[PDB]
Design a protein around this ligand. Sequence first.
Ligand SMILES: *[C@@H]1O[C@H](CO)[C@@H](O)[C@H](O)[C@H]1NC(C)=O
Ligand SMILES: *[C@@H]1O[C@H](CO)[C@@H](O)[C@H](O)[C@H]1NC(C)=O
Ligand SMILES: *[C@@H]1O[C@H](CO)[C@@H](O)[C@H](O)[C@H]1NC(C)=O
Ligand SMILES: [Cl-]
Ligand SMILES: [Cl-]
Length: 291
Amino acid sequence: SPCPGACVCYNEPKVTTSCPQQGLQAVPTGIPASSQRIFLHGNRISHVPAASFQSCRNLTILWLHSNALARIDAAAFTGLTLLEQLDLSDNAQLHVVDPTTFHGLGHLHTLHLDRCGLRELGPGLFRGLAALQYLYLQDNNLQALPDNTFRDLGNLTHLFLHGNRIPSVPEHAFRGLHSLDRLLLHQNHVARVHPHAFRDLGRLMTLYLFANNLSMLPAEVLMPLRSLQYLRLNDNPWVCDCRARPLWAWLQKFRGSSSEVPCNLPQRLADRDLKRLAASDLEGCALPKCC
Ligand SMILES: *[C@@H]1O[C@H](CO)[C@@H](O)[C@H](O)[C@H]1NC(C)=O
Ligand SMILES: *[C@@H]1O[C@H](CO)[C@@H](O)[C@H](O)[C@H]1NC(C)=O
Ligand SMILES: *[C@@H]1O[C@H](CO)[C@@H](O)[C@H](O)[C@H]1NC(C)=O
Ligand SMILES: [Cl-]
Ligand SMILES: [Cl-]
């Protein structure tokens, strides 16, 4: 009932404890348990100990973005069964989130983890988040996209993975993402995508793969994308020879909107758009399956 010194407390529209840009070193004590929204963004909170908000059982929105988060306890968010929105973004030194941290958050809808310097996504990190719809993981330091990382995210519609260093996409990286509408994998180091990586992405409408390291792409990887409407493949070292014929054939039938597919090789077809090429331009080689 009394508001912490660095905070503003009001009841409408939701019970809110707001303490942004107050130079707070840690989570302020005495936050009203009736709080539905807590805003602690813009401080210098470095650690989030266990049960830091356990008394706030009605908490649905928690902002911790733009702090100095270096360590989050695995039980930091226990008791927050009604939490819908969690923001931990803009904490470039966070590096690693404990795989148990998000467990039990069955009402979570949006999870902001953009710019957190995340080195990896540990096993079971997004386990049981069946209500999650928006997952922000851009501008981190990811080096892998392990199988079944998002297996339980059946309600996920937006997945942001751009601005990382993911080298490849394995077969079961995106298994279970039946509701996925937009998938942003641009500005990574993707050198190869498994032929069946997008098997469950039949409702996907937007796929960004530009600014990667793709020289070739099996046409079978695009086949499950029945609902695709937007595709970006530019800024990739595409090799426009015989190996590009399957991808070429698919692009000729694609009724959606695709970007340029710039040929890096051969020298003759440099920066020509692959989809705008004739079939005759795609003969001969320039190790692949057709040479
Ligand atoms: C949560 O909200 C309900 C309904 O308004 C209320 O009865 C309960 O006391 C609240 N919990 C806390 C910890 O304030
Ligand atoms: C997924 O969303 C739909 C509607 O948006 C909802 O009816 C359903 O309960 C959600 N699934 C889960 C597991 O929360
Ligand atoms: C693309 O990936 C290959 C390995 O598959 C690697 O040798 C090459 O350096 C990468 N290119 C860039 C620009 O990183
Ligand atoms: Cl400080
Ligand atoms: Cl399945």
